Amino acid sequence: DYDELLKYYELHETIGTGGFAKVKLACHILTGEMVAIKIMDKNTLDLPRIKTEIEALKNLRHQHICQLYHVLETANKIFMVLEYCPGGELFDYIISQDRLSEEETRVVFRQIVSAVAYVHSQGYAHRDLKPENLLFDEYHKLKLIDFGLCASLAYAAPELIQGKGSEADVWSMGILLYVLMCGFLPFDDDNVMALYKKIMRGKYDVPKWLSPSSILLLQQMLQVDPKKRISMKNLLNHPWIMQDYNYPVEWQSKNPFIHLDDDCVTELSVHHRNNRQTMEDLISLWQYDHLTATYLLLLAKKARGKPVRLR
Ligand SMILES: Cn1cc(Br)cc1C(=O)Nc1[nH]nc2c1CN(C(=O)N[C@H](CN1CCCC1)c1ccccc1)C21CC1
């Protein structure tokens, strides 16, 4: 139940619902930082989905991946405390704009490619890429979410639906690119089997406002045969991707966990009136408990150019 969570967080409103989970806005008491808490019920659960996401996020640390802070499991519930992104979903952003210019699309799309390339570099495929799974953070940069399916029909690759992961992610990014520049899906139908057929055929409308280079890139990402599909490697430095930037997508993590931050370690030891070495030792266990949560939220203060202070 909520007694364990309420020790550390003030709970606010529900900001999202899923089939088996909800996400609530909350504030971390010790740091005053806003967070987003994904809440699951262990009775009405699937559960492998939760464990999959948790394991992935413990191993992924990247400027375009929504950060995990804290995992709490009670008798009845599982709580995942995640980064709060105050800019909302990419999908809702596209609808409000109708569609994005090629220029703004490229700004956003390069961030998606950065995240997904990194995910692949760490040995995973996301498998559920869609604009509902991309959020805008405090600096209006994109953060990828929902790793429950890592190793929706409108975004699934032909070979994935066929049951015949890396290439499947490229296809989904092709659908995303189309939606960004067009404001609607390339394959859509009320009838699910009719949608399946359309995806298998691979034919789609090419709107009048797409540039020849955009058209070519969509063609290369939306190849029905995954062997003919552009590879992640060649996506990183694609001429469309390079335009106006003149350097390939920077996919490597810019915020990896190397050494513990001295300033964060000191603030925790001072606040808790604890032996510094004991504090450094307990943080290093990386249990994703309240200690880890407080440590990581202090690091976020620092990344924001703010002082590392508690209470
Ligand atoms: C929608 N919105 C509007 C504003 Br302003 C901020 C947000 C917002 O969602 N912020 C936010 N920050 N961090 C998170 C979110 C939403 N959020 C989510 O994880 N949201 C997903 C959203 N889905 C995509 C397809 C269906 C479910 C979710 C997953 C399970 C249950 C409910 C929601 C995270 C927790 C990591």
XYZ file of C-alpha atoms and ligand atoms in Angstrom:
347
model
C 0.000 0.000 0.000
C 0.791 3.740 0.008
C 2.243 4.050 3.538
C 5.749 3.152 2.354
C 5.628 5.597 -0.568
C 4.193 8.445 1.492
C 7.294 8.294 3.729
C 9.318 9.818 0.903
C 6.866 11.449 -1.566
C 3.926 13.855 -1.573
C 1.494 12.451 -4.142
C -0.269 14.643 -6.643
C -2.593 14.036 -9.499
C -2.696 11.115 -11.903
C -1.032 12.241 -15.148
C -1.498 8.993 -17.069
C -3.329 5.682 -17.173
C -2.460 2.422 -18.939
C -4.023 -1.032 -19.122
C -2.391 -2.207 -15.896
C -0.623 0.859 -14.456
C -1.041 4.509 -13.596
C 1.464 7.347 -13.404
C 1.161 10.001 -10.702
C 2.880 13.342 -10.335
C 4.690 13.490 -6.983
C 7.287 15.506 -5.099
C 10.342 13.944 -3.455
C 10.184 15.323 0.088
C 13.901 15.608 0.854
C 14.925 17.440 -2.352
C 11.681 19.135 -3.370
C 12.108 17.659 -6.876
C 9.039 16.665 -8.918
C 8.992 13.015 -10.017
C 6.606 10.723 -11.883
C 5.600 7.529 -10.089
C 4.410 4.509 -12.049
C 2.099 2.413 -9.850
C 1.194 -1.242 -10.446
C -1.056 -3.635 -8.532
C 0.443 -7.107 -7.934
C -3.064 -8.626 -7.810
C -4.758 -7.294 -10.947
C -1.543 -7.655 -12.997
C 1.708 -8.406 -16.868
C 4.353 -8.715 -14.119
C 7.164 -9.852 -16.451
C 6.604 -6.463 -18.163
C 7.412 -4.578 -14.932
C 10.532 -6.613 -14.202
C 11.676 -6.230 -17.833
C 11.449 -2.431 -17.690
C 13.109 -2.221 -14.239
C 16.072 -4.362 -15.323
C 16.545 -2.350 -18.522
C 16.441 1.060 -16.785
C 18.992 -0.048 -14.197
C 21.328 -0.561 -17.191
C 20.474 2.486 -19.322
C 21.764 5.933 -18.494
C 21.486 8.514 -21.268
C 20.575 12.102 -21.978
C 17.503 10.982 -24.001
C 16.259 8.194 -21.730
C 13.822 8.862 -18.871
C 15.774 8.197 -15.635
C 14.792 5.607 -13.017
C 15.235 6.790 -9.417
C 13.578 4.410 -6.968
C 11.863 1.036 -6.942
C 9.536 0.154 -4.057
C 7.630 -3.099 -3.781
C 5.025 -3.588 -1.062
C 2.747 -6.557 -0.314
C 0.209 -5.330 -2.910
C 1.944 -2.712 -5.086
C 5.023 -1.973 -7.194
C 6.158 1.660 -7.381
C 8.626 2.939 -9.969
C 9.812 6.499 -9.408
C 10.858 8.097 -12.681
C 11.935 11.443 -14.050
C 9.062 13.927 -14.425
C 8.995 15.527 -17.885
C 6.948 18.740 -17.698
C 6.652 19.155 -21.502
C 4.284 16.219 -21.949
C 4.069 13.682 -24.788
C 5.516 14.183 -28.268
C 2.190 12.987 -29.718
C 0.187 15.804 -28.101
C 2.836 18.232 -29.354
C 2.447 17.107 -33.000
C -1.359 17.417 -32.823
C -1.127 20.973 -31.479
C 1.257 21.922 -34.318
C -0.601 19.865 -36.962
C 2.817 18.724 -38.212
C 6.427 19.783 -37.802
C 8.584 21.472 -40.422
C 11.450 19.382 -41.811
C 13.806 21.594 -39.776
C 12.026 21.024 -36.444
C 11.448 17.360 -37.299
C 15.194 16.915 -37.721
C 15.844 18.557 -34.312
C 13.461 16.120 -32.600
C 14.284 13.073 -34.736
C 18.028 13.287 -34.074
C 17.243 12.922 -30.335
C 15.106 9.851 -31.009
C 17.934 8.330 -33.087
C 20.454 9.183 -30.309
C 18.310 7.383 -27.684
C 17.546 4.313 -29.839
C 21.136 3.929 -31.134
C 22.332 3.975 -27.496
C 19.666 1.437 -26.485
C 20.911 -0.835 -29.308
C 24.538 -0.217 -28.283
C 23.701 -1.554 -24.793
C 22.256 -4.710 -26.349
C 18.496 -3.946 -26.284
C 15.667 -3.321 -28.747
C 12.860 -1.047 -27.506
C 10.107 -2.613 -29.657
C 7.417 -0.054 -28.686
C 8.635 3.174 -30.284
C 5.811 5.694 -30.803
C 5.293 9.374 -30.050
C 3.306 8.512 -26.899
C 6.577 7.011 -25.573
C 8.615 10.158 -26.077
C 8.309 13.027 -23.575
C 9.623 16.578 -23.407
C 11.819 17.288 -20.374
C 12.500 20.572 -18.548
C 15.003 21.652 -21.227
C 12.520 20.742 -24.023
C 14.594 17.735 -24.972
C 13.095 14.295 -25.652
C 13.137 11.424 -23.176
C 12.302 7.868 -24.239
C 9.992 5.899 -21.897
C 8.339 2.471 -21.379
C 10.840 -0.329 -21.715
C 8.332 -2.978 -20.729
C 8.521 -4.691 -24.103
C 12.218 -4.389 -24.715
C 14.271 -7.482 -25.636
C 1.167 0.034 -31.197
C 0.206 -2.099 -34.232
C 0.481 1.014 -36.453
C 4.194 1.264 -35.444
C 5.090 -2.436 -35.677
C 7.428 -3.729 -38.406
C 6.032 -6.315 -40.902
C 8.510 -8.990 -39.776
C 7.674 -8.347 -36.102
C 3.924 -8.809 -36.611
C 4.792 -11.862 -38.748
C 6.676 -13.253 -35.717
C 9.585 -14.051 -38.079
C 14.684 -6.470 -32.932
C 17.168 -3.861 -34.134
C 15.666 -3.583 -37.662
C 12.146 -3.524 -36.213
C 13.115 -0.397 -34.219
C 14.295 1.270 -37.472
C 10.899 0.616 -39.074
C 9.119 2.128 -36.064
C 11.360 5.206 -36.267
C 10.280 5.442 -39.938
C 6.644 5.542 -38.854
C 7.600 8.184 -36.238
C 9.410 10.266 -38.854
C 6.344 10.126 -41.114
C 3.993 11.186 -38.280
C 6.318 14.058 -37.301
C 6.350 15.541 -40.814
C 2.772 14.605 -41.858
C 0.607 14.678 -38.707
C -1.040 11.317 -39.427
C 0.031 7.667 -39.789
C 1.255 6.167 -43.089
C -0.709 2.966 -42.358
C -4.073 3.245 -40.635
C -7.452 1.521 -40.605
C -10.427 0.872 -38.290
C -10.165 -2.798 -39.210
C -7.089 -4.337 -37.549
C -6.584 -7.049 -40.236
C -6.953 -4.428 -42.967
C -4.210 -2.447 -41.173
C -2.042 -5.588 -41.074
C -2.522 -5.916 -44.866
C -1.570 -2.266 -45.456
C 1.611 -2.651 -43.390
C 2.572 -5.815 -45.304
C 2.098 -4.056 -48.663
C 4.158 -1.055 -47.538
C 2.386 1.497 -49.735
C 1.588 4.919 -48.244
C 0.521 8.449 -49.207
C 3.322 10.925 -49.896
C 2.023 14.384 -49.043
C 2.805 17.411 -51.204
C 4.895 19.181 -48.495
C 7.589 16.512 -48.127
C 10.982 17.299 -49.711
C 12.652 14.799 -52.073
C 15.297 14.018 -49.417
C 12.608 13.342 -46.779
C 10.797 11.063 -49.234
C 13.989 9.100 -49.891
C 14.721 8.638 -46.182
C 11.172 7.404 -45.519
C 11.575 4.942 -48.397
C 14.794 3.601 -46.883
C 13.358 3.195 -43.353
C 9.975 1.824 -44.452
C 11.285 -1.115 -46.494
C 9.014 -4.107 -45.808
C 11.971 -6.466 -46.207
C 14.265 -5.872 -43.194
C 17.292 -6.838 -45.321
C 16.611 -3.882 -47.670
C 15.922 -1.523 -44.737
C 18.497 1.142 -43.806
C 20.624 0.104 -40.813
C 20.984 2.098 -37.600
C 24.652 2.632 -38.524
C 23.792 4.382 -41.816
C 21.000 6.336 -40.167
C 23.482 8.100 -37.841
C 25.205 9.933 -40.730
C 22.423 9.952 -43.373
C 22.518 13.081 -45.587
C 18.979 14.024 -44.461
C 20.103 13.619 -40.829
C 23.289 15.658 -41.496
C 21.629 18.624 -43.102
C 22.214 21.810 -41.153
C 24.202 19.898 -38.545
C 27.098 18.559 -40.549
C 27.998 15.935 -37.944
C 26.484 12.472 -37.300
C 24.007 11.913 -34.457
C 25.751 11.879 -31.064
C 24.349 8.687 -29.526
C 26.925 7.913 -26.820
C 25.812 8.698 -23.253
C 26.901 12.175 -22.118
C 25.994 11.475 -18.446
C 27.332 7.972 -17.647
C 27.900 6.728 -14.089
C 31.665 6.841 -13.564
C 32.632 8.055 -10.073
C 30.305 9.133 -7.303
C 29.738 12.885 -7.250
C 31.658 14.362 -4.302
C 29.225 17.260 -3.787
C 26.222 14.903 -3.635
C 28.038 12.457 -1.309
C 28.980 15.345 1.018
C 25.483 16.837 1.168
C 23.999 13.423 2.050
C 26.605 12.717 4.749
C 26.099 16.225 6.199
C 22.293 16.099 6.084
C 22.141 12.598 7.554
C 24.941 13.349 10.030
C 26.605 10.155 8.854
C 30.171 8.958 8.372
C 31.096 10.035 4.808
C 32.758 6.691 4.000
C 29.667 4.788 5.199
C 27.538 7.064 2.971
C 29.779 6.533 -0.061
C 29.627 2.752 0.620
C 25.820 2.619 0.873
C 25.223 4.733 -2.263
C 27.566 2.375 -4.144
C 25.217 -0.552 -3.442
C 22.890 0.966 -6.089
C 19.840 -0.664 -4.573
C 17.474 1.887 -6.122
C 16.111 2.609 -2.670
C 15.479 6.017 -1.140
C 19.189 6.618 -0.739
C 19.741 6.057 -4.476
C 16.708 8.247 -5.260
C 18.018 11.125 -3.127
C 21.509 10.783 -4.644
C 20.220 10.795 -8.228
C 17.888 13.714 -7.648
C 20.821 15.737 -6.236
C 22.836 14.940 -9.392
C 19.893 16.304 -11.424
C 20.058 19.566 -9.441
C 23.731 19.789 -10.453
C 22.975 19.051 -14.145
C 20.506 21.975 -13.949
C 23.256 24.321 -12.698
C 21.682 24.360 -9.257
C 23.400 23.843 -5.877
C 23.261 20.390 -4.240
C 21.086 21.061 -1.141
C 18.610 19.003 0.935
C 15.512 20.172 2.872
C 1.172 13.645 -20.158
N 1.903 14.753 -19.492
C 1.508 16.029 -19.575
C 2.441 16.693 -18.838
Br 2.366 18.652 -18.589
C 3.418 15.912 -18.285
C 3.028 14.655 -18.733
C 3.752 13.394 -18.418
O 3.250 12.337 -18.751
N 4.898 13.470 -17.743
C 5.661 12.378 -17.405
N 6.891 12.554 -16.849
N 7.467 11.273 -16.667
C 6.530 10.405 -17.078
C 5.401 11.036 -17.640
C 4.441 9.989 -18.145
N 5.195 8.715 -17.918
C 4.776 7.522 -18.360
O 5.345 6.464 -18.115
N 3.692 7.538 -19.135
C 3.223 6.367 -19.856
C 2.432 6.893 -21.055
N 1.884 5.878 -21.964
C 2.287 5.890 -23.362
C 1.229 5.014 -24.024
C 0.201 4.635 -22.956
C 0.829 4.930 -21.598
C 2.373 5.537 -18.967
C 2.691 4.190 -18.775
C 1.892 3.388 -17.960
C 0.759 3.933 -17.351
C 0.435 5.276 -17.554
C 1.236 6.084 -18.357
C 6.537 8.960 -17.344
C 6.731 8.154 -16.047
C 7.872 8.190 -17.049
